[PDB]
Write a protein that binds this ligand. Structure first.
Ligand SMILES: [Cl-]
Ligand SMILES: [Cl-]
Ligand SMILES: [Cl-]
Ligand SMILES: [Cl-]
Ligand SMILES: [Cl-]
Ligand SMILES: [Cl-]
Ligand SMILES: [Cl-]
Ligand SMILES: [Cl-]
Ligand SMILES: [Cl-]
Ligand SMILES: [Cl-]
Ligand SMILES: [Cl-]
Ligand SMILES: [Cl-]
Ligand SMILES: [Cl-]
Ligand SMILES: [Cl-]
Ligand SMILES: [Cl-]
Ligand SMILES: [Cl-]
Ligand SMILES: [Cl-]
Ligand SMILES: [Cl-]
Ligand SMILES: [Cl-]
Ligand SMILES: [Cl-]
Ligand SMILES: [Cl-]
Ligand SMILES: [Cl-]
Ligand SMILES: [Cl-]
Ligand SMILES: [Cl-]
Ligand SMILES: [Cl-]
Ligand SMILES: [Cl-]
Lengths: 408, 411, 411, 411
């Protein structure tokens, strides 16, 4: 009856304690984690590996505060002090003793991204994976190569699969996605919940509430008379080398669109602190660090992107979208590296140059009519499922889970 | 579920290993010892905590070598390279990696003294305890005080009890000892084997093997025409003085003995090791022979014409030969006056005279025939009580038990 | 790069953390206890190992509260929520994180009994020992035997020796105590402050404060016209029986006392706590009051017209008042015939008569003044020998000593 | 008192011991490996990771046997029982106690391929790397990508680089390989020994020893009146199918070759091991001889009138003989088209023609003498650029270097 796994965790924990390693917190938790540590009314939330108080976990958590305020709520953050969380939740810092206590104790884990494999998901706890968008580029199991530092394509997939098996529930936005998850994530369909993303709830429920639209606008200090264009290009390793002004030509957009529009730039953080918008105030508004992207969609009159899954979220609003695929050349030529037919059925025009994009923008209603058919077809395939009830569904499922647990 | 006893062991072993402690061998052993390390045909032996190749475990071993070569024999010593073992047995050194293996693998343990409590006797293993004498002085449970340093009487007894509980079998010499052992050792009688001491088999089987008697006599350069007195006093603490550089001459007075008996007798001094290498026998050569470091005490009984002792369990072993015995209790005052710190009534029923002074003793030794005649009935009765059990078949009974035990296992 | 002493502490703490041992608070403390933790203006107090807010630590503290309000005062108790401390002090529970902090952080330890060896008295810190009374019974080095379960006299003295070696200051009531301490506690005279007990201050400064005497008196609900006997016998194992449910009545004879003195006197019974809550005093209301739980014993002396005791260090305290004492040694024969297990000559030089029967004692009490006269000579001798030192200034001496120590550190 | 790295090893060894891992041999070695263990006259040989007794290390060893019979020579093998070693050397099995002793003790390591990074090449030891051939395919540093399971292109390169930094000496066959090694292996020219390969010594010294050419031939049961063609295609992943049971007959068309070359030739097939056990040479007996398992590839060369190959560094060894070579690249079009995945221009500067179909190859073979003359100019250029550096004295150079090293070390 020699417990060989126990013996390994002890050696490791002793090594950590003695060498003064920071992982001592982790090895202790690993030694001592029992099924018995779990309390049914403790729930943990984490989004994007602990960077933010945001999207789907945020809305799940906000719904649960309104209707079930007596459970113990915990949020996990890389830096708790820099994140404001409303309500009763306590914040824990990643990799701190309280972090491990929290995950050891919680009966439910809620998140939208992968959680670390050194955390143990007991048969005793329920891991709810919201994920973070309808896939466009291939991922997980569906990938061909991944020359990603430190890891082989197989060892990376081995690991991804290890994580997904721990997923008890996995939220889905659309049939297309479920079909994809089933393959890509190794998921059994039983475990999939095609209920839409909680983070898209506002896109259905609050799209007309003007007092709310007007709050979002003045918090960003937007001009009262101008329409809002949002630009959210994906990150490209290519363009890293003071950055060369955006490809989309701000100078030109200003001359072309300044009298009618303000444009919201949503860049990667690294592009955001290189961007110098002197000369563009009241026209070009850095919005990279804004906490809630769903609120940005709500106040946005059209959306420019290239190859991001945000197009599917935003498409719920049936507003116009443009695709500035300036580098579409480089991206594989006849790119089947995407799950869907990009050159054909997206809700808007593909421009490879920004100058004709600008003119087109000059009159939105023409575009809205011209791609109405294409917009609707897109709404019907990818958005024909968001009720606006998604936070309620998870929220209620968790409640009902933890009642059965407070009984036998 | 968390296995806490293992975790404690693991921590202990890590500590010893990092700190360069000698007991790392012990903690590795303790950590990994499983009921599965045990091989039925492996048998360990030690006597007197590994001082000797000797006593009852010696004779159990030499029996099994003759009729049971097939098995794996191990002997444990403090210093293996200083001990000669006949036959096939391997010899491990105490506290060494091989010592713990041996004790981990063995299905039988055979010894005559207490084995350490840090060794684990598994439900899997049979611990056979021969012990080492019919008791005279009250031991273990029956003691009243043990002002032994660092330890209290309760804790010393607690430890002794932990030990005897591990004894699967316990050898007994006579009904007297069985009663005593049942009490002092906390023994179940089911577990006591009244068979005699394997180490006293030769006192039954060989008293008259003249050629065997003579090997012994010549090994000790004993002069041919002389009778043989053995003197074996227990150790007295009162007597230790001066770093033990020089001891006052023995109270039995060798000088007087040489004058009185020097022509007819030779005298073998069996002393404690401290007295022995302090003894100066200059001027008593071929009369007084130090025999303290002699391997086999039984062999010395066989060639002895009488025994002189005071308070030792040896009187009980020698009693088998029915020869004369003298009790030189010079210090009997000191010993409590009318002391019942002795299981038997020392004052009434020993097989011989109590002499508090050595000169009367010497005169008596002049005529040995007269002493035999004089105390024959006291000798005969002492034989009937404490020595009427040895068939000289004890070594045999134990060996056959071991062999029968391991046959069952081999299925 | 890793020291062995830390590695040992480190392993122990892992053990306690994972095993959920309650000593986890202690292994953590043993780990992080650095000389740098010491805040010069922090002081800890504890009397009788934290049973109480009382005795000499209490008075050292009350004096410092008045004259040095701005230090961090900490009191340690077994059960802090059942203790009432006046002033600015915060209180900690034994063996809690705060307990260990306080002791790590303090520049000064103040107490009247041995404090645990797992606490670390660093070079940095000053440990002031007040002890708790002039010895009558032999203690520490001076005891001959200590048959106290689980330990040995040598290991008990070793440990006691360890504790006193950490006492930077030791208070002394008299030269007799000093001379005894220099031997019994392995102390240098250089470390003894012969200044008297802080707890005794009130006996010197307040015996004539009638308002104070009135508080104490009306607090106990004592009759107004009646004088006051106090009775405080030492504990005796010989008398504990029946799980302690019902005791045999006091050998002093309350009935007789009640008949003989019940109109002139009231008697305060100060008994061991086990005896106190077994005594049924029904029938003696307003005559014999149980006073065994009273917080403060010096106050009980102040209002007492005489003391009745037997073998107790209290006689040396009460003696400051130069009042009649009596000594009801009813078992005085049991106590060793000519027992020199006392430092003083009990049979002779004590302040009052020895009575073995209660009844002569009763008659004697009838007229206190006559007793004060007969023994005025002896009371004076006793006051000269044991009580002459008390300035009423003891708490001042300690409080100012501490104050002078922390002014230096403040650089 | 305890250093950090020793702790890490210590704990790793605990894990191996308790958990009965085979790697315990290794963890012990890591703990006990001291710069002191080294014995100046102990020298250790391994070739191709221990699969063989063979190429350069063999010849370095055979030379030092003849001339320095009095050193401790050790050879390392995966399975020592299956390898015959001439002379005095003792054998060791990889990952055994003896194996780790050998590398710890040796003042010199001789090898022809990467040795494991868990072995400690001390500042005390000299690690001579001969490697195993002039490159054609890019290696190490110069590889662009390597999607080879279990490792990443950067991790692969770090590990490789870690290993070559351990090389004190590295043998080069030619300047060409030197300009290459310098980059691919991160070498300092100071450490490269351009002497030629010892395995190629016989290519110079014995190309005429008929008694010797004959022994090889009569070992292989080769016909008397027939010339020898050798074929040595590199392994190709593509061609392995169906569990590797039945292969598709060689692309070279053996039936054709028989018809064409039979009455004058015999063809030595040197394939991958996996192909050798798949080839059914039934009915080609005495024409096509499987030579895949033959221990010495240079003996194979010495007796060959020409060599058919495709992409292999053996063309550079054969080149020393200035004999005709053919390049049967039936899949040259698969290989990158115009691939510079090669360090030389294949299409241009090799010593024979490139054929893509085997039928012209065969016709050409029919008249060796026309080919030798028609291509002499190319064969001589090849020999100059790649083969003009072997004096036949490489083995003696490396032997004499080791010797010089260990005369000094002897002090
Ligand atoms: Cl709960
Ligand atoms: Cl923080
Ligand atoms: Cl975004
Ligand atoms: Cl463990
Ligand atoms: Cl076996
Ligand atoms: Cl030895
Ligand atoms: Cl031997
Ligand atoms: Cl003598
Ligand atoms: Cl003996
Ligand atoms: Cl270090
Ligand atoms: Cl140290
Ligand atoms: Cl502890
Ligand atoms: Cl301070
Ligand atoms: Cl102050
Ligand atoms: Cl409390
Ligand atoms: Cl105390
Ligand atoms: Cl201390
Ligand atoms: Cl006292
Ligand atoms: Cl103690
Ligand atoms: Cl005095
Ligand atoms: Cl009473
Ligand atoms: Cl290892
Ligand atoms: Cl050497
Ligand atoms: Cl082998
Ligand atoms: Cl190395
Ligand atoms: Cl070249």
């Amino acid at each position: 009856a020699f417990k060989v796994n126990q013996f390994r965790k002890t050696l490791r924990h002793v090594k950590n304690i003695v060498l003064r390693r920071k992982n001592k917190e982790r090895s202790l938790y690993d030694l001592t984690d029992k099924e018995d540590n779990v309390k049914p009314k403790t729930i943990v939330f984490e989004s994007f590996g602990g960077k933010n108080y945001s999207d789907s976990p945020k809305y799940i958590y906000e719904y649960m505060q309104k209707y079930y305020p007596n459970y113990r709520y915990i949020w996990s953050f890389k830096n708790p002090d820099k994140n404001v969380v409303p309500g009763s939740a306590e914040k824990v810092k990643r990799n701190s003793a309280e972090y491990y206590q929290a995950y050891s104790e919680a009966s439910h884990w809620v998140s939208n991204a992968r959680t670390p494999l050194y955390l143990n998901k007991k048969e005793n706890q329920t891991y709810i994976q919201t994920w973070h968008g309808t896939p466009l580029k291939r991922l997980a199991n569906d990938m061909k190569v991944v020359r990603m530092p430190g890891t082989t394509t197989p060892k990376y997939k081995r690991n991804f699969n290890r994580e997904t098996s721990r997923w008890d529930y996995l939220i889905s936005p659309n049939r297309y996605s479920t079909e994809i998850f089933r393959s890509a994530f190794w998921m059994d369909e039983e475990r999939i919940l095609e209920i839409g993303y909680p983070r898209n709830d506002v896109l259905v429920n609050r799209a007309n509430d003007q007092e709310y639209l007007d709050e979002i606008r003045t918090h960003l200090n937007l001009p009262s008379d101008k329409k809002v264009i949002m630009y959210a290009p994906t990150w490209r390793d290519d363009e890293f080398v003071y950055l060369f002004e955006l490809k989309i030509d701000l100078d030109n957009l200003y001359k072309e669109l300044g009298d009618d529009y303000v444009i919201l730039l949503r860049m990667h953080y690294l592009i955001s602190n290189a961007l110098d918008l002197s000369g563009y105030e009241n026209f070009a508004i850095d919005v990279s660090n804004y906490n809630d992207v769903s609120e940005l969609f709500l106040i946005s009159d059209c959306l420019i992107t290239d190859y991001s899954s945000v197009m599917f979220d935003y498409g719920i609003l049936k507003r116009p979208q443009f695709f500035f695929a300036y580098d579409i050349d480089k991206y594989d030529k006849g790119l089947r590296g995407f799950y869907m037919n990009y050159m054909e059925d997206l809700p808007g025009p593909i421009y490879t140059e920004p100058y004709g994009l600008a003119k087109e923008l000059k009159n939105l209603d023409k575009v809205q009519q011209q791609y109405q058919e294409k917009i609707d077809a897109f709404y019907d395939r990818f958005c024909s499922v968001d009720n606006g009830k998604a936070s309620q569904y998870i929220g209620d499922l968790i409640h009902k889970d933890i009642k059965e647990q407070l009984e036998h």
